[PDB]
């Protein structure tokens, strides 16, 4: 499956300016568009080479859409103050994630339209795309309003229609980068510890996409329980890094193996401290 997602944030900073508004759009885990109210001339801007192909109308419409959402999020923030009886001196956050997961097929797998207030769940469109889940008494007020306005059906039409259609077009136009694989380049490092044993660290560098499995083995056993793992992290050029370490006795290096599994590899790698 593939995904198109829009991550939206509005943050009030009372006493140091108007609330900040941001949008960022992703295909899979790859960022392609952004809008930021703090920019000089706030406008939708490309964040990948493949989206630059879209003509000026695309940018004008997306800009006007973001500006409309911005005005609407600023009203939401003021409304949230009344619903929660908060003052106009505190800084508050409103987040929204909307988008669609489609199968290799192209049909919809999951639609998302969900809000959070100060980093807590506020309201979300249910998986059925018909009803809402309000998290508290304040969100119940919003739910009631939105059911009376027929919001759910309008939003289902975007998630089932435009979202799915545009994802399929983005996957085609950005085919080169989005649907590529790059294999991990791996190596093992070796560090003598003061306890008298050694750290073996298995690196995986420059791979795309982010999914990968790094494991250490001693004679075929998986050693999952005793392995240090960092989170997969962006190298800042579109590729990813990850490492897994183990502690092993000083003379038993050659008995441990690192295994790397990735879509870009013709065969999974097996490494050893050399």
């Amino acid at each position: 499956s593939h995904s198109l997602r829009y991550f939206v944030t509005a943050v009030s900073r009372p006493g140091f300016g108007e609330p900040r508004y941001m949008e960022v759009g992703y295909v899979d885990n790859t960022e392609f568009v952004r809008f930021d109210s703090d920019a000089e001339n706030p406008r939708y801007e490309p964040r990948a080479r493949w989206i630059e192909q879209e003509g000026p109308e695309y940018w004008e419409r997306e800009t006007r859409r973001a500006k409309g959402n911005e005005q609407s999020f600023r009203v939401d923030l003021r409304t949230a103050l009344r619903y929660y009886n908060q003052s106009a001196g505190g800084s508050h956050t409103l987040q929204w994630m909307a988008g669609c997961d489609v199968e290799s097929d192209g049909r919809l797998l999951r639609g998302y339209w969900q809000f959070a207030y100060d980093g807590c769940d506020y309201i979300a469109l249910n998986e059925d795309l018909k009803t809402w889940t309000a998290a508290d008494m304040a969100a119940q007020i919003t739910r009631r309003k939105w059911e009376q306005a027929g919001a759910a059906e309008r939003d289902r039409a975007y998630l089932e229609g435009e979202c799915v259609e545009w994802l399929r077009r983005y996957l085609k136009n950005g085919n080169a980068t989005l649907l590529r694989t790059d294999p991990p380049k791996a190596h093992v490092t070796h560090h003598r510890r003061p306890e008298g044993d050694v750290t073996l660290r298995c690196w995986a560098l420059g791979f795309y996409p982010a999914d990968i499995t790094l494991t250490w083995q001693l004679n075929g056993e998986e050693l999952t329980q005793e392995m240090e793992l960092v989170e997969t992290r962006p190298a800042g050029d579109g590729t990813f890094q990850k490492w897994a370490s183990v502690v092993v006795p000083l003379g038993k290096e050659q008995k441990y193996t690192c295994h790397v599994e990735h879509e870009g590899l013709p065969e999974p790698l097996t490494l050893r401290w050399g």
Partner: peptide, 9 residues
Amino acid sequence: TGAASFDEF
């Protein structure tokens, strides 16, 4: 393309 939020709290 992204979604429009026509409905307020």
